[PDB]
Amino acid sequence: GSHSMRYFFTSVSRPGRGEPRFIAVGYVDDTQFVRFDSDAASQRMEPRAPWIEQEGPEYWDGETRKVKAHSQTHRVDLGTLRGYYNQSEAGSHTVQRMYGCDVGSDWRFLRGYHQYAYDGKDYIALKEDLRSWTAADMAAQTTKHKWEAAHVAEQLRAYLEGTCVEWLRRYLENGKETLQRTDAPKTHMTHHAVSDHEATLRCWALSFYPAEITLTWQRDGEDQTQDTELVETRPAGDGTFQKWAAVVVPSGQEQRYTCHVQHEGLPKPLTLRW
């Protein structure tokens, strides 16, 4: 199947409370493998998967240097950006940056991404072709102009099509037992009379990986899109995910309803009935 390597960066200015807070995290698919906290004691890039720990001192020195440079870059950006938006020095503001690559099932480049947000809003983003920028504001166009001038697109495209894909493959091999696994969902149903003339059917999927799953309720084969309560897929904390979907059904109609579970770890989609 397809895979992704993704880095997420958050910088939060805290006026009179110190240097901005900086948090970096890296994923391969739905597994975190690294982290940096500006407030942490190590002041290093740190492992958060066992398969990355086998990388040598060169890697960790290399990744600390680069992430410290990401942190500094955002420190300037925070100050620049408040200037661009004529904002005060006393308010706290947030810079977010995401970048990474997807590979298809053939393990060749599929997509690259680079997006940047000020105070939770699209600011500047690299376009699909990894050649051009999408600038939200006129301030973004000033960044757009800086970056076009410095040929950022070209430097970043090389990373996303090249280095990013190369390292994603190394991680998929080093972490083959964890990253190239599918944990099929453990499924069950519950029934709860919500009143005296209707009941709740809850369809459960537990211990699944990857996070991607489809839970649908049908009545006589007809999907019940607008009648389904559907929680956001959630982490178990052990590297697996959970989800449920619920319908409220008249008492006596239970058997008309089927839950359908679609997940990559399942040879066939599961049909579950009460």
Binding site: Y7, G26, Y59, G62, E63, K66, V67, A69, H70, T73, V76, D77, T80, L81, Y84, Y99, Y116, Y123, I124, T143, K146, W147, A150, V152, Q155, L156, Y159, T163, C164, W167
Partner: peptide, 9 residues
């Protein structure tokens, strides 16, 4: 591995 960041906004 991380991108070699260059260029502030």
């Amino acid at each position: 591995a991380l991108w070699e960041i260059q260029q502030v906004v």
